[PDB]
Design a protein around this ligand. Sequence first.
Ligand SMILES: Cc1cc2nc3c(=O)[nH]c(=O)nc-3n(C[C@H](O)[C@H](O)[C@H](O)COP(=O)(O)OP(=O)(O)OC[C@H]3O[C@@H](n4cnc5c(N)ncnc54)[C@H](O)[C@@H]3O)c2cc1C
Ligand SMILES: Cc1cc2nc3c(=O)[nH]c(=O)nc-3n(C[C@H](O)[C@H](O)[C@H](O)COP(=O)(O)OP(=O)(O)OC[C@H]3O[C@@H](n4cnc5c(N)ncnc54)[C@H](O)[C@@H]3O)c2cc1C
Ligand SMILES: O=C(O)c1cccc(O)c1
Ligand SMILES: O=C(O)c1cccc(O)c1
Lengths: 614, 614
Amino acid sequence: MQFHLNGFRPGNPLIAPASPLAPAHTEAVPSQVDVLIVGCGPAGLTLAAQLAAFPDIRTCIVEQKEGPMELGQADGIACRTMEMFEAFEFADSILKEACWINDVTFWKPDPGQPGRIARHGRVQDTEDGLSEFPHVILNQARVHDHYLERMRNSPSRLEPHYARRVLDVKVDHGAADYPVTVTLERCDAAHAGQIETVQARYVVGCDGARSNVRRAIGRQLVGDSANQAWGVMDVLAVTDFPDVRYKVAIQSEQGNVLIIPREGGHLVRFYVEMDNITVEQLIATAQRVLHPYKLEVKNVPWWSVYEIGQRICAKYDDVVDAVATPDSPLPRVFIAGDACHTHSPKAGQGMNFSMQDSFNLGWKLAAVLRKQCAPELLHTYSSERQVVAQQLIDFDREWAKDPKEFQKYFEQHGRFTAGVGTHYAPSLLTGQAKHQALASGFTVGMRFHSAPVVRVCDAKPVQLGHCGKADGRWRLYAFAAQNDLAQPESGLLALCRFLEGDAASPLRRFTPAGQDIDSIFDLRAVFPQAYTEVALETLPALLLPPKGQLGMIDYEKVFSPDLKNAGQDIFELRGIDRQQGALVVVRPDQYVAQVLPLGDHAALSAYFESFMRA
Amino acid sequence: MQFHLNGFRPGNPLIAPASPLAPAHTEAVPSQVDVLIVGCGPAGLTLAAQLAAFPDIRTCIVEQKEGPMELGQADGIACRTMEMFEAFEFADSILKEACWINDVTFWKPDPGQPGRIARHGRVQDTEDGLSEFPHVILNQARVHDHYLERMRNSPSRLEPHYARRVLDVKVDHGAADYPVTVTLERCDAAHAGQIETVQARYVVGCDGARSNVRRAIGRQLVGDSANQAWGVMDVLAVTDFPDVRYKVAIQSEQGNVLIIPREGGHLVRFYVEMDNITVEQLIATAQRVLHPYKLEVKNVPWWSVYEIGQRICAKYDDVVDAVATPDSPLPRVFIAGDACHTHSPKAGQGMNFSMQDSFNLGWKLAAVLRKQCAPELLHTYSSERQVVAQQLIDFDREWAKDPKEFQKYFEQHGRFTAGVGTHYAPSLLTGQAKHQALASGFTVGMRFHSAPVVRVCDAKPVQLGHCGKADGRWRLYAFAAQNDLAQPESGLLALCRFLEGDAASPLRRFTPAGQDIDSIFDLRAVFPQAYTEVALETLPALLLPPKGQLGMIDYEKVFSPDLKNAGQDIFELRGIDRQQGALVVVRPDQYVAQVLPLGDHAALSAYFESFMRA
Ligand SMILES: Cc1cc2nc3c(=O)[nH]c(=O)nc-3n(C[C@H](O)[C@H](O)[C@H](O)COP(=O)(O)OP(=O)(O)OC[C@H]3O[C@@H](n4cnc5c(N)ncnc54)[C@H](O)[C@@H]3O)c2cc1C
Ligand SMILES: Cc1cc2nc3c(=O)[nH]c(=O)nc-3n(C[C@H](O)[C@H](O)[C@H](O)COP(=O)(O)OP(=O)(O)OC[C@H]3O[C@@H](n4cnc5c(N)ncnc54)[C@H](O)[C@@H]3O)c2cc1C
Ligand SMILES: O=C(O)c1cccc(O)c1
Ligand SMILES: O=C(O)c1cccc(O)c1
């Protein structure tokens, strides 16, 4: 992290100075806002945390509950989700508190012994090289706590307006501004029944399975009925079952159970398959399933009956057209998370997929509100997120049931549950991949698979993808050709010359006057030479850019590979064409948009000209 | 970290429940306390943070300054210091905010060019395998902030009594209890001149170079005059000097300068050698030294003239006897940090050595106050800490000046500056090492050099030494012999049987009735077999101990080596005798006290009987 850019600032640097652009939080909900977010669940808080970074945007998030939750329903945190948490700068804390899932063990009835289970298998939960983060388990409420802290400490000093139930949402297609009218009812005793009305430019329903926003815009969850029903209980118990601290799938003649070890080393969650349910019944069933192993429950902090069918909305916004074109009406209301797609418990997605909906939408709304991107960009939210959620359902539709074909489905299921399987098809934002071989390890349309590199300014070993923070900026990862440092006339250095000095450059065309040169496009250069061979003093100013009020130099734009440790060279690991180099264009949500030749300046310009505004 | 032991507890688990044993903080300093700590510098806060973990002990820490500092004088954080920060559970946060020192570069005059410097060398700052943590740089104030937060969130809810200047300390050798009388003067305007008096059982002067506590007990810093004088300035500047983000030693005909890159990527500290100094003069000198590289200073958050000689007290307590025996008077007042030893700027110790003084004393004071250890244990504070500080001075005394002999001194200097060179000589606490070959990598008298292992309960890869938290507990790391799992009649399992069931066992003799079985002795077993081969259900209850009010099982006492990654097996890395196994006894300050045969139960008992109380 970088700080003290404009002068010494005492205290925790993660606490940003309050921006004068963001009015102080008021007891009453403001009369007009840029974005009204409905629901403080994972989807809403992810979106709020993202928008909190932009104090010039007036964001209001409402929640019917009267305050933050202390114990949540979800607890699974996927590898790709941890990568997003790193973008929000709190992955470290989650890693220290959460229960890591390293192995998953499988138990089944013992062939030579009646009414007893025995261990039948064990698998490494996350395949080697899949992600730099592990899969972990942590009370949903703690994730909310981190987002709320991020919102509070942001320049916006954003905090929720609790005890507010959104009753209706209406779009006035003839309105000049703030065309969306939201009606809310105050739920606390002190204001019970009081009605509040808010006018907004955009509204996002992150209000869950029974979303009133979805209903307001006439969308409906289409799918199959509750495929199954699960009794779920978080317990503090004593057992002699040896695998209780692992994630465990148990099949027995007494019923099926899934064990999810919880944060703290003691709490454990049991999913008991079912279909007047009491916790006593759930416990009794788990005991019968675990026999001969004993289970003595001392305390049950929470339990419930988790049952939901797989359903999905045909569209995630208020635009009727199934597939939008340049003449379709522009969207004003969006729905994210469970409000538009519910995945069966089998899917194993938990709250992970819902938060990716918000991470997709956040930067787009910010860019459009700031007049940096055409409103048409907003159509890509539904077209990207609805499609991948439906494709996921199609897969889990069949995954619901040769021996090497099963292992294949098992492996794919692992990539999907880890959240790294998302692959957007060609579109306004995603290329066709005709130059994929320039960087074969950075698949166009998929998330930027981070790899180690060494920072040239100080030899620090770092993960390249961690340059991608949740600050709304696009990233340009330029991997230099072998002779680029020695031959500035072409390749990487020529690209830099073009970006900084050519009027047609997207950097010159789209970076607002007066802002830092890397405020829209975050360019990072990676050379194949050892860090000791890259002379910073000889590089273009674009790669050692001054920024802020004092013109301080940003020394973190230049990297080399890890050449000390065998097999850790990113050019090898990510299949970079060494003789040609490659430009990997990454969106603010960390998804790869393009893999282009370093010298195709015209294509780079044309890409951004297609949706950004000068 | 483990939590929810006695029931579900919402919020950040690092915030402990307030103990009813610790009275609330009062505006006035209490009239009587167990421990009075003077000074909220690194030494005092380290000690306070340690004692804050024991709510049954009444600790009061006073400081003449009126509040916490925002910008400190020291900034170097050594590898061994990071290991202690990990023991206090905040190393993670420091790693994310601090500026890592990966390489150190050296610059000297360019042979073929007048008045100009050129790079002459580069070295990896921390040798491979030295520590699991890097050497980092971070504003002293931020370290204080972490300790203050730890103190505040501890069960004791400990916070300093600011604006108090200790004027005198007197020991009444005829007093029945609280024999030490401390006189304090309130410094704030509101109480300017008001005198407060506190009676304490023990007083620790962590009041710096001009310590009033040291003066009160007649001790004096003996040594040489200021060997040198350094102009020090923390600046936000723009330079084209290529190595500004590295730690850099610069020698030129215009003067000598040391560059220390600071947290945040922009701030930089310059030490300018000297001997009416103004910052303008310091800047002018740095510019002349850096020529032809330019240095344009935009802002100077802080600067000063750091000049101190190498001095040390002959003893760190109020006991006259040079070397205490069983008939010497018992100590009541101790001095730590700069109050008893000042190391030249060349030493490169910063605030690191001072905090180790407190980490040495903390657990000893707690054990004595709790009547768990004989008061004689307190003599070991001075005998251990004064000796290693003097030996350090002797070394830096000669280090102050064949070519392969210089590299030897350079390498040793590196181990010393990283803080891992401390090696206590045989004593009441430290053995002779006649069984050192049982575990050659765990040198008796030196800190426990952590290595990777795999936790059996959940296959989590962890650092074994991180079991050693700053909670005052002794650690017993038992490395099993090859056949121990298969032959319980001897070796590790027989040791467990002895520890839990034999009346002469130190565990049975010294663990207070009613407390958890691992409340004094934290036993961790490490087997050479893969984690998948260690059946938890077959192990003694001592290795899967129930604890707390609900009898929840602690699943973190059993480990195996990392056998997945080549060359990561701790039995190989730390030279464990595979056929014999080894018991490594580690003190609450992470220093190895003994390396004993697993079967020498008599020696284990005798060791603890020599200073613990039943
Ligand atoms: C009873 C129950 C048990 C569950 N158990 C599990 C489980 O065991 N494992 C698992 O993986 N997942 C479980 N889930 C699902 C998991 O909690 C969700 O998938 C996840 O929370 C979805 O995230 P989200 O952001 O889309 O919405 P949600 O988490 O559903 O949050 C929506 C939010 O919007 C608010 N809201 C709704 N309507 C309005 C309105 N009109 N006005 C204002 N605020 C409104 C809600 O109060 C809530 O805070 C469970 C869900 C429920 C309801
Ligand atoms: C002007 C100055 C510049 C320095 N510059 C550097 C540098 O550039 N680099 C470096 O590595 N080190 C530097 N140091 C030294 C570094 O700050 C110390 O080595 C480190 O702080 C020592 O830790 P300590 O805990 O022993 O005591 P200190 O940090 O000295 O703290 C002692 C504390 O006790 C308090 N105190 C003292 N007397 C009393 C009393 N009678 N009653 C109550 N409270 C009292 C003080 O106000 C202070 O907070 C500098 C020190 C000074 C004074
Ligand atoms: O994170 C998971 O793997 C998971 C899968 C199912 C339920 C659950 O709570 C967690
Ligand atoms: O941490 C260091 O290596 C160091 C050495 C000297 C001065 C300083 O501030 C820091």
